[PDB]
């Protein structure tokens, strides 16, 4: 192209030079103009650019005619050659290239399911205003070109977030993003897919590729199904002790729901416990201020000082609560025989060893180092915590491991109840699980909901009956993992039908759990919660006689946070209210799955948080049980032995009332500290929260039975008789 242009330019310039210097033949060559060749070159360039100074021009008739023809020909040639110029310019690759590493600036790589909602939730959980100063840059890697809205989302955070087009399975793309120097690799899963197993296999392949490129990198991955994560144990370079973690969405979510079934509001407490919330000051006498006094708490890990060695757990916990003002929940007992295990509130028979990790709940991380620099010789006399310095002076009843209730397998025909049969029997104090399932819908893994409710830590008479209300076609595909549990019944029907709800005595159940399985079919993300919201509103509007469904405890799974306010009959005080400040969330009646997207962030800055949550929420599942389930894809019963019976002794989450219990004389105006100390000393009971009536601070009486959550109140916090106390109760025989 350049050669053609230059040759045409030079030829035209020379031809103009000839015709101008020669002159017109019919004028006897008297109109010739003295014009050098380079001046003609200059004239041609000025002409072709459509500038036309007019300092030099053609004066002869032939010169003007040839200039007209050259202008026409040049315009035609340029119009014809524009497409080749466009092809030379080409289509620039917007997201091609490589990440430029910066010294003293850590970066993490995020891959997997990179879409608008997932990226938005991950950035909301990770890039938070209340987050402390952290020098981590997020680099997204995905092979699908982003759409306009997600590109705008990246442009909003261009100073901290970068995007590159590539594939994890291609080692060159891994070299582009500098995966050899990345702090960690975070893999997100497609929560809305027809086949969860294919997504799990793809994520496992991505993990395998990343570990093949660099075996020493830390990986945090999302897993859809619980039975697939065992494949991660087949990778030789997958080191769980070095920070590689798999977060099972279904397992954690259904465990949260089950623990809230045992004690309502626990899911809200846990979600607020590892989430970073902006500080808001409220002075009006409402429930929001009492709630926000408990939202501020966070969870940390710390190594106990040498002064605590040889002392029992209740003594150290009482010293931490009274002196250091710290709530120490659990310890990490290390025994070379049985590796390391997190013990949740162990009894007084156990003593603190040397270098034992402990889990604390505290307002700020600065006040956590007290347990590391505490010496009785120089700090016992100190009263003010801030004054303390760092001075040093025949029949199978349980499973093989004996940690879950087990029964002989039974056919599904023995548990299906008709409406008349369900109405004939009387169910009180049970759990009703409404499922919006379908024969072609994706499995949600209902076993993760039943195992925490069927743990061996409970007695047989304390077990709550579980009644599944939904399509039998969907439930037959899940019965292969639920037929080994003692008390499970099925009512074929629809959760939206009032007759089925009246048959199972919905007004007498301890908890109603609404779950949806047809989430991938709906294209619009905000309409994925229609059936759950409709079911909740239908149940809340029912009438009963011997009186209304507004007092029925309900837990609803919701995908979008903005739909949570739809579960409150009262008008929205502000449609821009944050998720944690809404009444349904603060009361524990709604479970937004987005908090799981926060947990990964809490996993990145501390790997012990995920392990503590797993050992507190999933009912105490052990790696040995994980290996057995991987081997057999089922739960195997076994005869009772003294070792398994000793394995039965654990601690369970419960709520206690102060109306008529042993602490009734203290609930009328007494402080929370005396209650905590008495419960810890006498019954080895760990109180860690108050479930308080919403209309309790008001002087006027009210009929509302809704309660909100106060997490770890101070020592001088007052008590009212209409309160519930969260507690971790020891097993008693």
Ligand X SMILES: CC(C)CCC[C@@H](C)[C@H]1CC[C@H]2[C@@H]3CC=C4C[C@@H](O)CC[C@]4(C)[C@H]3CC[C@]12C
Binding residues for Ca(2+): 565, 568
19 binds, among ligand AJP, ligand X, K ion, none (CB under 5 to 8 A by kind): ligand X
Residue from the set 5, 81, 460, 715 that interacts with ligand POV by CB under 6 A: 81
Please choose which of a second copy, ligand POV, ligand X, none residue 315 contacts, taking the beta carbon within 5 to 8 angstroms, the exact cut-off set by kind. Answer: none
Under the binding rule (CB under 6 A), the answer on residue 29 touching ligand POV is no
Half-sphere exposure of 279 (CA within 13 A, CB side): 7
Least Å from the CB of residue 148 to ligand AJP: 7
Which of 33-41, 171-179, 198-206, 266-274 is the region at the interface with ligand POV (rule: CB under 6 A)?
Answer: 33-41
Q: Is 701 in the site for ligand AJP (CB under 6 A)?
A: no
**Nearer CB in complex with ligand X: 67/539:** 67
Q: Select from 42, 95, 373, 479 the one that contacts ligand POV (CB under 6 A).
A: 42
Q: Residue number with the shortest CB distance to ligand X?
A: 22
**Residues linked to residue 111 through DSSP beta bridges, in sequence order:** 187
Q: Of residues 352-381, which lie at the interface with ligand X (CB under 6 A)?
A: none
CA distances from 103 to 136, 186, 233 (A): 12, 22, 34
Hey, which residues between 214 and 253 contact a second copy (CB under 8 A)? 215, 231, 233-237
Tokens found for residue 690? 């108050």
| Cβ proximity to ligand POV, 62 vs 450, nearer residue | 62
Give alpha helix (H) positions in 553-641.
583-586, 594-605, 608-617, 623-632
Place of tokens 């879950």: 404
Write the Ramachandran bin of 664: left for phi over 0, alpha for psi from -120 to 50, otherwise beta: alpha
Min dist CB 83 to ligand AJP, Å, is: 5
- Out of 65, 71, 72, 82, the residue judged to bind ligand AJP by CB under 6 A: 82
SS3 of residue 430 by DSSP = coil
Task: Report the candidate in 41, 50, 105, 42 with the shortest Cα–Cα distance to residue 74.
Answer: 50
Q: Does 70 bind ligand POV (CB under 6 A)?
A: yes
Q: According to the binding rule CB under 6 A, does residue 192 interact with ligand POV?
A: no
Which residue lies nearer to a second copy by CB, 437 or 619? 437
The verdict on 664 binding a second copy (CB under 8 A) reads no
The reply to whether 62 sits near ligand X by the rule CB under 6 A is yes
Decide: is 67 part of the binding site for ligand X (CB under 6 A): no
3-state secondary structure (DSSP) of residue 543: strand
Q: What 3-state class would DSSP assign to 515? A: strand
Q: Does 171 bind a second copy (CB under 8 A)?
A: yes
Task: Choose the one of a second copy, K ion, ligand X, none that binds residue 25, judging by a C-beta under 5 to 8 angstroms depending on kind.
Answer: ligand X
d(CA 15, CA 21): 10
**Among all chains, which residue has been given the structure tokens 């159940």?**
509
Least distance CB 609 / K ion (angstroms): 12
- The tokens for 499 are 């007759």
How many residues make contact with ligand POV (CB under 6 A)? 21
Residue list, annotated binding site for Mg(2+): 137, 160, 162
State both tokens at 139: 């680099």
* Beta carbon nearer to ligand AJP, 75 or 194: 75
Residue 533 contacts a second copy per CB under 8 A: yes
Q: Which two tokens stand for residue 33?
A: 């103009």
Phi, psi for 90 (deg, rounded to 5) = 75, -175
In angstroms, what CA-CA distances link 493 with 132, 594, 633, 726? 51, 30, 29, 35
**83 touches ligand AJP (CB under 6 A):** yes
Pick 155 or 386: Cβ nearer ligand AJP: 155
Which of 565, 615, 618, 711 binds a second copy (CB under 8 A)? It is 565
CB-nearer residue toward ligand POV: 48 or 534: 48
Residue in 7, 22, 61, 286 binding ligand POV, rule: CB under 6 A? 61
Binding segment (CB under 6 A) for ligand POV, from list 63-71, 343-351, 362-370, 693-701: 63-71
How many CB atoms lie under 10 A from the CB of residue 252? 22
CA dist 434 and 436 (Å) reads 7
CA distance linking residue 608 with residue 242, whole number of Å: 11
Q: Does residue number 25 form part of the binding site for ligand X (CB under 6 A)?
A: yes
From the list 79, 88, 393, 395, which residue makes contact with ligand AJP (rule: CB under 6 A)? 79
State which of residues 22, 52, 64, 380 lies at the interface with ligand POV (CB under 6 A): 64
Question: Least Å distance between CB 18 and ligand X?
Answer: 5
Q: Which is nearer to ligand AJP, 77 or 280 (CB)?
A: 77
Beta strand 431-436 pairing with 511-516: parallel
How many CA atoms does the CB half-sphere of 678 hold within 13 Å?
13
Q: Could you tell which of ligand POV, ligand AJP, K ion, none binds residue 78, using a CB distance below 5 to 8 A set by kind?
A: ligand AJP
Asked if 694 contacts 708 with a C-beta cutoff of 8 angstroms, the reply is yes
Which of 18, 417, 550, 696 forms a contact with ligand X (CB under 6 A)?
A: 18
Residue 701 touches which member of ligand AJP, ligand X, K ion, none, C-beta under 5-8 Å by kind: none
Q: Which residue reads 């050098």 in tokens?
A: 36
Tokens of 232: 């991660």
Binding-site residues, in ranges, read 137, 160, 162, 565, 568
Count of C-beta atoms within a 10 Å radius of residue 337: 4
Angle between helical axes of 37-48 and 2-22 (0-180°, round to 10): 120
The residue count for the chain: 733
Q: How far is CA 391 from each of CA 305, 354, 370, rounded to the nearest angstrom?
A: 12, 20, 11
Quote the least distance from Cβ 409 to a second copy, whole Å: 36
Q: Counting Cβ atoms within 10 Å, is residue 414 exposed (0-12), middle (13-18) or buried (19+)?
A: exposed
Tokens of 372: 């590391």
Instruction: For residue 266, give every residue at least 6 positions away whose Cβ sits within 8 Å of its Cβ, in sequence order, or none.
Output: 256, 259, 260, 588, 653, 726
Q: What x-and-dash track marks residues 463-502 binding a second copy by CB under 8 A? A: ----------------------------------------
Q: How far is the CB of 60 from a second copy (least distance, A)?
A: 12
- The dihedral over CA atoms of 230, 231, 237, 242, expressed in degrees to the nearest 10, equals -30
Residue 575, contacted partner among ligand AJP, a second copy, K ion, none, CB below 5-8 A by kind: a second copy
DSSP conformation letters of 99-123:
---BTTBEEEEEEES--HHHHHHHH
- Supply 729's token pair: 């109760």
Classified as helix, coil or strand, 699 is coil
Any contact of residue 714 with a second copy (CB under 8 A)? no
- Find all residues with CB under 8 Å of 709, minimum gap 6, and list them: 265, 268, 269, 272, 291, 294, 586, 587, 588, 689, 690, 691, 692
**Which residues, including other chains, have CB under 8 Å from residue 440's CB and lie 6 or more apart?**
none
If binding is defined by CB under 6 A, does position 78 make contact with ligand AJP? yes
The one segment of 202-210, 301-309, 581-589, 698-706 that binds a second copy by CB under 8 A: 202-210
Contact 247, 667 (CB under 8 A): no
When binding is defined by CB under 8 A, the residue of 31, 33, 37, 57 that contacts a second copy is 57
Query: Is 190:249 a contact under the CB 8 Å cutoff?
Result: no
Q: Mask 568-607, x = binds a second copy (CB under 8 A)?
A: -x-xx--xx-------------------------------
Question: Pick from 611, 612, 609, 604: which is nearest to 218 by CA?
Answer: 604
Residues that bind ligand AJP (CB under 6 A): 75, 78-79, 82-83
Where on the chain is the footprint of a second copy (CB under 8 A)?
38, 41-42, 45-47, 49-55, 57, 61, 64, 67-68, 71-72, 75, 79-80, 83, 85, 89, 92, 167, 169-171, 174-175, 198, 201-202, 204-205, 208-209, 212-213, 215, 231, 233-237, 522, 526-527, 529-531, 533-534, 537-538, 540-541, 562-563, 565-566, 569, 571-572, 575-576
- Binding interface with ligand POV (CB under 6 A): 8, 12, 27, 31, 36, 38-39, 41-42, 61, 64-65, 68, 70, 73-74, 76-77, 80-81, 84
What does the binding site for ligand X look like in residue numbers (CB under 6 A)? 18-19, 22, 25, 62
């Amino acid at each position: 192209l350049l050669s053609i242009f230059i040759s045409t330019w030079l030829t035209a310039a020379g031809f103009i030079h000839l015709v101008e210097n020669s002159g017109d033949p019919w004028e006897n060559f008297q109109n010739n103009q003295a014009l050098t060749y380079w001046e003609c070159v200059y004239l041609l360039m000025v002409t072709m650019s459509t500038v036309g100074y007019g300092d030099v021009y053609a004066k002869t008739t032939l010169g003007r005619l040839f200039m007209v023809f050259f202008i026409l020909g040049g315009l035609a040639m340029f119009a014809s050659y524009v497409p080749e110029i466009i092809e030379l310019i080409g289509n620039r690759k917007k997201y091609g290239g490589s990440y430029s590493a910066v010294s003293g600036r850590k970066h993490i790589v995020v891959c997997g399911h990179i879409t608008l909602e997932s990226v938005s939730n991950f950035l909301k959980a990770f890039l938070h205003k209340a987050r402390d100063d952290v020098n981590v840059e997020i680099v997204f890697l995905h092979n699908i070109s982003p759409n306009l809205e997600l590109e705008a989302l990246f442009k909003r955070h261009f100073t901290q977030v970068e995007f590159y087009q590539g594939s994890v399975l291609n080692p060159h793309d891994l070299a582009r993003v500098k995966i050899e120097s990345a702090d960690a690799c975070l893999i997100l899963a497609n929560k809305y897919c027809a086949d969860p197993d294919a997504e799990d296999a793809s994520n496992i392949m991505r993990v395998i590729s990343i570990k093949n490129y660099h075996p020493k990198i830390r990986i945090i991955t999302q897993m859809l199904q619980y039975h697939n994560k065992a494949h991660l144990l087949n990778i030789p370079s997958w080191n769980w002790k070095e920070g590689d973690d798999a977060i099972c969405l279904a397992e954690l979510k259904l465990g949260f729901i089950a623990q809230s079934c045992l004690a309502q509001g626990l899911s809200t407490m846990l979600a607020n416990l590892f989430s970073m919330r902006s500080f808001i000051k409220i002075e009006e006498d409402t429930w929001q201020k009492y709630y926000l006094e408990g939202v501020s708490n966070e969870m940390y890990t710390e190594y106990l000082s040498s002064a605590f060695v040889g002392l029992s757990f209740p003594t150290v916990c009482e010293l931490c609560f009274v002196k250091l003002k710290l709530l120490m929940i659990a310890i990490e007992y290390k025994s070379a025989n049985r590796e390391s295990r997190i013990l949740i509130n162990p009894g007084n028979h156990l003593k603190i060893q040397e270098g034992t990790l402990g889990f604390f709940i505290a307002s700020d991380a600065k006040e956590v180092k007290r347990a590391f620099f505490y010496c009785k010789a120089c700090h016992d006399d100190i009263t003010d915590p801030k004054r303390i310095k760092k001075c040093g002076c025949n029949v199978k009843k349980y499973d093989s491991t004996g940690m879950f209730h087990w029964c002989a397998p039974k056919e599904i025909e023995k548990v299906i109840l008709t409406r008349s049969e369900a109405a004939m029997t009387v169910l009180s104090g049970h759990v009703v699980v409404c499922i919006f399932g379908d024969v072609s819908s994706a499995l949600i893994g209902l076993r993760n909901l039943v195992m925490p409710l069927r743990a061996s830590n409970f007695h047989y008479h304390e077990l709550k009956h579980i009644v599944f209300v939904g399509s039998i076609e969907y439930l037959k595909r899940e019965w292969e993992t639920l037929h080994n549990f003692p008390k499970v019944s099925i009512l074929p029907g629809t959760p939206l039908s009032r007759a089925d709800l009246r048959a199972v005595n919905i007004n007498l159940c301890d908890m109603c759990v609404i779950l949806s399985a047809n989430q991938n079919n709906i294209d619009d993300t905000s309409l994925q919660d229609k059936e759950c919201i409709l079911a909740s509103l239908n149940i809340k509007s029912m009438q009963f006689d011997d009186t209304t469904g507004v007092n029925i405890p309900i837990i609803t799974e919701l995908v979008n946070d903005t739909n949570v306010q739809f579960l409150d009959q009262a008008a929205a005080a502000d449609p821009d209210t944050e998720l944690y400040l809404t009444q349904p969330f603060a009361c524990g009646t709604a479970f937004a799955v987005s908090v799981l997207d926060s947990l990964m962030s809490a996993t990145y800055f501390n790997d012990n948080i995920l392990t503590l949550i797993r050992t507190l929420v999933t009912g105490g599942a052990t790696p040995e049980l994980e290996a057995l389930i991987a081997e057999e894809n089922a739960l195997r019963g076994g005869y009772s032995t003294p070792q398994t019976l000793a394995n039965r002794d654990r601690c369970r989450v419960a709520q206690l009332a102060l109306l008529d219990g042993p602490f009734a004389d203290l609930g009328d105006g007494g402080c929370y500290g005396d209650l905590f100390c008495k419960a810890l000393k006498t019954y080895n009971m760990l109180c860690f929260g108050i479930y308080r009536l919403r209309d309790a601070h008001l002087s006027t009486p009210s009929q509302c039975t809704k309660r909100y959550v106060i997490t770890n109140p101070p020592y001088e916090f007052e008590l009212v008789p209409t309160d519930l106390i969260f507690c971790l109760m020891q097993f008693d025989s």
